[PDB]
Write a protein that binds this ligand. Structure first.
Ligand SMILES: CC(=O)N[C@H]1[C@H]([C@H](O)[C@H](O)CO)O[C@@](OC[C@H]2O[C@@H](O)[C@H](O)[C@@H](O)[C@H]2O)(C(=O)O)C[C@@H]1O
Ligand SMILES: CC(=O)N[C@H]1[C@H]([C@H](O)[C@H](O)CO)O[C@@](OC[C@H]2O[C@@H](O)[C@H](O)[C@@H](O)[C@H]2O)(C(=O)O)C[C@@H]1O
Ligand SMILES: *[C@@H]1O[C@H](CO)[C@@H](O[C@@H]2O[C@H](CO)[C@@H](O)[C@H](O)[C@H]2NC(C)=O)[C@H](O)[C@H]1NC(C)=O
Ligand SMILES: *[C@@H]1O[C@H](CO)[C@@H](O[C@@H]2O[C@H](CO)[C@@H](O)[C@H](O)[C@H]2NC(C)=O)[C@H](O)[C@H]1NC(C)=O
Ligand SMILES: *[C@@H]1O[C@H](CO)[C@@H](O[C@@H]2O[C@H](CO)[C@@H](O)[C@H](O)[C@H]2NC(C)=O)[C@H](O)[C@H]1NC(C)=O
Ligand SMILES: CC(=O)N[C@H]1[C@H]([C@H](O)[C@H](O)CO)O[C@@](O)(C(=O)O)C[C@@H]1O
Ligand SMILES: *[C@@H]1O[C@H](CO)[C@@H](O)[C@H](O)[C@H]1NC(C)=O
Ligand SMILES: *[C@@H]1O[C@H](CO)[C@@H](O)[C@H](O)[C@H]1NC(C)=O
Ligand SMILES: *[C@@H]1O[C@H](CO)[C@@H](O)[C@H](O)[C@H]1NC(C)=O
Ligand SMILES: *[C@@H]1O[C@H](CO)[C@@H](O)[C@H](O)[C@H]1NC(C)=O
Ligand SMILES: *[C@@H]1O[C@H](CO)[C@@H](O)[C@H](O)[C@H]1NC(C)=O
Ligand SMILES: *[C@@H]1O[C@H](CO)[C@@H](O)[C@H](O)[C@H]1NC(C)=O
Ligand SMILES: *[C@@H]1O[C@H](CO)[C@@H](O)[C@H](O)[C@H]1NC(C)=O
Lengths: 487, 485, 484
């Protein structure tokens, strides 16, 4: 006739950390952080990305001779570009608002080349110009998308061109103006002086004047070229007029499948896989709600935290050794709480039903809640800046770092707090069960000193299950117990 | 014959949430989130706002003929403007640094129109130009503040004008340049080519050259007009000089009564009402410290939280001895002192514990309100179509800060709810075992959170017991004699 | 033959705060905030700063005659500059991208002046020009680092100049263009009209045109000057070419020592002392991990929080058995174990719970001071008069982040205080109930929180029950006999 209280223990070895103690041991724990990747660039949802190779965005758009494989591109999901591309602008020059164009391009998925000004339409000029900088097989050449207008014979008639956008979507147009290096070159190229280039649309008004100066040679050239761009609207019209130094476009780019994408800076190549999201260092395939690989990602993946370990305790403090004051019992595999019984006719290792289910519900509800709360984390997006906007770059970097630090601190503190609370709740529950049993057993027994007491009158297995069900009736057979303790 | 401990209960049915479980019932609860608005736009401390109606800011400033009701404007409190006003620039063109002007205007309450350059002072030019773009009653017209200088006869003498700012406050001046669409138009208008417009002050020095090209027709016009602005200082002067294509001003705006204001983006209309803080969706009249209507407000108004429920539990768990449930028969205090003597009974309560309980919860609520008084407040801003990066940066800033503060508020509320519940349980248990310890062994524990007094006594006995002055040597001998049986 | 449980008490009168009540007296408390300073500016790590005085950055770089002390400058640590310097541009004008230049200069520790275009090389023009705006001792003068080119006789031949950067590091070059105020002045100064100034490098291409207009008189002059700057790279070349209105440079600045520094907008003068961190109000020499002096600091120094009190408790709640209050005579540990046998008494304390309490306190202190080590730092910046939106956005940045971090710190310390007090109470109660549990029933609880013993034990009994080695079946027959 003996019953005692304890808890289930096993041979686990995982460890967790709390606000007051470190590397403490627990019965069951669940990880929350993913830190492995396959280290490859692979397809996203079956749509292979666009591999720029050695070229650059400007080289691809203008049609550099080297980038001959990019004359027609299918749909893509993200753009892969190197850090310092080689084949950029073959003829030296610049590009106004490069970074704005890149930011706009970041959210475009497909393109469509449209011929807006056929080359042969210029019947009063020369259109076969080319330089040695952009040369193939020794012979000079030029970009594949623009036309160089030079005087034919000995005169340069005024050049006029216009287009009405009836394609069906917004169009992107690029044009350029050439700056010579000395007056003799200007005279022998355009047979005029003091020329101008004027571009007009419904909302854009521009008029540029070529500049002549002496500059250091780049790629064996003393000249320069300056390019500009604009977004042509629906049913609008753009007008071209110049007296020289004009680089007219020959193709227009029409946005067709505007979606969500990004630009990724890496040096890798393209493999054959299929992931759910991509990272510059590789691809991630996991279900945990956290990762610490790289702050910039494309697709869908868990949040990024700048930590290294995040372990959530969901069990008892494993303290292996017939009572709860010495430790748990290895023989308990059914429930989480000890209700060991030992009658005269036999013993048993029963558990308590009420406590186990409430504990299970509490822990699963709390796990769901802690997962759910952090769903509003901050996310980062790549951006570009020129060399005259250092303040903006500093501001952007500070934003990213500050928000990442704040969220990291929040998550770590929450996890440590939760571990501590879980341990305290479990131990509180164990004393709660014990003293509930003690008051239920109105005297009639003495504590041996092993966290449990021995009954002073002989009950039976019916009495055991009656006490277990919280249905013990003290005045029912109290007289025999009184007689026994009278001894 | 015995006394028992319990706690007061009632029939309230409000629900709160905590970290461990959700949707639990407490006797008394408080609310912190306000989520109702009257859906109207009205005054602000008796100062009606400025209702631009169907005009944009540029149209009002330049003096578009449509916005003829805004020629003179009294003091205002905030400015209401539609998303895409119809009457903006009648003559097609552009405005330089529009967004900076709007941001500067966001913190000015009153204006004052001052005539600086009288129209009749130009005695060597023609000042009756106009166009069909800004036409009233069929006849061509122009803006009501600028002057279009054209050639008189067949010559265009150089134009000179100046003004010295002695008004007594900073001034705002606007001028403009005109770009024709062909050489013949320029020759017909100004008789000369290769002209220029020069503007010079003590700090700003500028010079523009008119540009000629062919453009698509907008509003039936091929030309364009470019406008620029500057701020004059006290006791400063500004000099105008040009040979053509000059759009001279006639009125300067003097800044008086600088204060705090804003720009409001809505399609509503002013009504007859009074409020204390205003939102794009309506007014707010409440004393709670939180709301979730709209992030942009004007005037003093509670903090904004992107959530939907915020309830602070200040009571006990509701259930129907203290181990079986509470008692509805107790309303004076909080904790149970069910007394039942031989000659009577009672439902007294511990007045002492109630005092520390109520002051604790009150200062807790006050502190919780206090900690979040330093919230982050958003401010409206405007960006052109060439600063998408800046606009994205600003939007990300706002969303990040709002999310951070929302998370903080929710976590704090849950923490406090759990702490309060555990605290109340702790005081109940502490009172129980303290009473048991004071009573020592001169009784028998009935096992129902109540022990039956074993020593016989009148009201003085347990009166001293609740007073904490129970004397063991008073009734140890008789109790021992009785329990010896 | 009696024992009782208690806790050590002292006479300390330091009050702490918590989320439940205010101004609670404790036994031992720490501090984490520093709020004092010497109110002086002096050397950082033994390297004196650069003291501009009354000259702005432009005045120093161009070589204003007033700032003659700054012709040669040694290494520095940070730059001291008044908010509205007087001796700026002696000749009225402007500067292109002034703020970008200041931001770039914020991270440079030493310069090096190199003569790239000697003055006498211009043999076809006149280089003795000067104005009354920058006048020393009555006679007209000019900037010390620029050359003004005028007509030579009655002709202005085309001016050309070039320089190849072989110095060995990145160089900074400054040039300028002159805007007259009337046509007669332009003719009498340069003999030509419709001139231009052209500057060309491997990356920068520019061509400006002088502008003529009427302007108000500033400093007695109606003209204006416009300056620009660029960064010359390794083995690059810069070409100058103009036909008038050119302000050619004479010295090039070479970036020698690159490091970390900043610009401080102060008003005082350099003093003679040493420090490790510097703030616009004074120097800080402490070891606590927080301060509330000024958001902008230079060097290494604790973090900035916008609070007024951060007190951490690390001891029992001070209050004069354990139910009556503390023990003034307990000076050994933290949990009393009062021993009193028939032959004598004792004041032994528990040496077990003390060590775990101490190590837990140390662990929590380290954790709290370590969690915030990844805080946010503020860096000074400057914005022009047409970038109000940028300045507003920067201010909102700084204020928001500071508020977030100070709120987090206060919340953490309050929770820590609550947990510590509750933990100590739990420890003492647990010790008492554990002692009672081992005692079994051979004593009667007097009511002072401790029980008078039943059967006459001795010092061996006393130390055995102290060690948790009591054996109830060993010696209880005497208790049973005397129970009657
Ligand atoms: C229409 C055209 O392409 N013309 C020239 C072109 C231009 O004259 C100029 O180079 C543009 O910047 O240059 C090309 O020949 C260049 C050649 O010109 C000599 O005069 C000079 O001495 C050489 O050093 C070299 O620059 C070219 O390949 O760039 C093509 C064509 O002759
Ligand atoms: C001084 C003035 O305002 N004159 C004209 C003005 C200008 O001549 C010019 O059009 C503004 O850019 O324009 C207006 O008249 C011109 C009108 O002439 C028709 O023949 C033509 O078909 C129209 O497109 C238009 O150019 C005008 O209506 O804009 C008014 C004024 O007489
Ligand atoms: C560009 O093409 C569109 C499409 O034809 C032109 O819009 C038409 O204009 C005529 C006016 O002569 C109207 O009768 C049609 O109804 C318009 N079409 C539509 C679909 O609205 C537009 O005018 C052209 N652009 C220019 C500058 O002429
Ligand atoms: C603009 O008006 C102001 C005020 O009339 C002029 O300032 C005065 O200038 C004279 C010239 O010596 C001084 O004697 C006065 O003391 C000035 N007034 C004050 C109040 O100080 C100013 O000169 C005028 N601007 C111009 C360009 O003449
Ligand atoms: C500036 O000076 C450098 C240093 O001499 C020049 O670089 C040399 O150029 C010649 C070409 O004739 C090469 O043979 C040398 O090997 C280069 N030197 C080094 C160290 O690489 C440079 O060319 C000069 N700048 C210009 C525009 O000529
Ligand atoms: C080469 C030169 O410096 N010339 C003269 C200049 C110019 O003529 C203009 O004034 C400059 O804008 O002006 C002064 O007369 C003057 O008033 O200080 C000084 C000098 O005699
Ligand atoms: C722990 O016990 C389980 C029980 O099945 C067993 O499989 C496992 O090997 C044990 N681990 C060790 C390290 O013995
Ligand atoms: C104890 O915890 C620390 C973390 O502070 C850890 O580095 C160490 O490995 C742990 N001890 C053991 C035996 O794992
Ligand atoms: C991702 O991992 C799961 C197992 O964790 C596997 O079943 C699945 O095939 C993986 N996905 C890919 C694309 O390899
Ligand atoms: C209370 O909240 C719980 C949360 O799971 C929900 O299941 C339950 O339906 C809610 N009760 C009511 C009455 O809405
Ligand atoms: C706001 O509501 C209270 C509630 O009674 C009312 O007394 C008060 O008049 C209201 N405010 C205004 C401006 O009407
Ligand atoms: C301690 O703090 C409380 C805050 O409620 C304040 O009322 C009291 O005056 C403070 N003590 C002293 C000595 O100022
Ligand atoms: C900083 O304070 C400590 C405190 O004693 C002192 O020893 C040290 O000399 C101080 N440092 C300086 C530079 O004065």
């Amino acid at each position: 006739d003996q019953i005692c209280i304890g808890y289930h223990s096993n041979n686990s070895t995982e460890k967790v950390d709390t606000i007051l103690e470190r590397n403490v041991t627990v019965t069951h724990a669940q990880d929350l952080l993913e830190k492995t990747h396959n280290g490859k660039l692979c397809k996203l949802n079956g749509i292979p990305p666009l591999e720029l190779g050695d070229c650059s965005i400007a080289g691809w758009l203008l049609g550099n001779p080297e980038c001959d494989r990019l004359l027609t591109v299918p749909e893509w999901s993200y753009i892969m570009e190197k850090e310092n591309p080689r084949n950029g602008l073959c003829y030296p020059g610049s590009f106004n608002d490069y970074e704005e164009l890149k930011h706009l391009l970041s959210s475009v998925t497909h393109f469509e080349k449209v011929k807006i000004l056929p080359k042969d339409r210029w019947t009063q000029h020369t259109t076969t110009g080319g330089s040695r900088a952009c040369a193939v097989s020794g012979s000079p050449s030029f970009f594949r998308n623009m036309v160089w207008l030079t005087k034919k014979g000995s005169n340069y008639p005024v050049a006029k061109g216009s287009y009405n956008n009836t394609s069906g979507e917004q169009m992107l147009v690029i044009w350029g103006v050439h700056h010579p290096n000395d007056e003799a070159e200007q005279r022998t190229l355009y047979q005029n002086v003091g020329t101008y280039v004027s571009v007009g649309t419904s909302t854009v008004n521009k008029r540029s004047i070529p500049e002549i100066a002496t500059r250091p040679k780049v790629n064996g050239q003393g000249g320069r070229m300056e390019f500009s761009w604009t977004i042509l609207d629906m049913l609008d019209t753009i007008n071209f007029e110049s007296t020289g130094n004009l680089i007219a476009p020959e193709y227009g780019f029409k946005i067709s499948k505007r979606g969500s994408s990004g630009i990724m800076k890496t040096e890798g190549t393209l493999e054959n896989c299929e992931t759910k999201c991509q990272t510059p260092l590789g691809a991630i395939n996991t279900t945990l709600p956290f990762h610490n690989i790289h702050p910039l990602t494309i697709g869908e993946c868990p949040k990024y935290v700048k930590s290294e370990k995040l372990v959530l305790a969901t069990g008892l403090r494993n303290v292996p050794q017939a009572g709860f004051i010495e430790g748990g019992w290895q023989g308990m595999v059914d429930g989480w709480y000890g209700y060991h019984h030992s009658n005269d006719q036999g013993s048993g290792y029963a558990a308590d039903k009420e406590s186990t289910q409430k504990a299970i519900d509490g822990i699963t509800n709390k796990v769901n809640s802690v997962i759910e709360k952090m769903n509003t984390q901050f996310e980062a997006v790549g951006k570009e800046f020129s060399n005259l906007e250092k303040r903006l770059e500093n501001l952007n970097k500070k934003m990213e770092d500050g928000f990442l630090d704040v969220w990291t601190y929040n998550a770590e503190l929450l996890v440590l707090m939760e571990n501590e609370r879980t341990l305290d709740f479990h131990d509180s529950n164990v004393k709660n069960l014990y003293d509930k049993v003690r008051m239920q057993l109105r005297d009639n027994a003495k504590e041996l000193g092993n966290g449990c007491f021995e009954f002073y009158h002989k009950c039976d297995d019916e009495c055991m299950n009656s006490v277990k069900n919280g249905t013990y009736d003290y005045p029912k057979y109290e007289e025999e117990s009184k007689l026994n303790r009278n001894e």
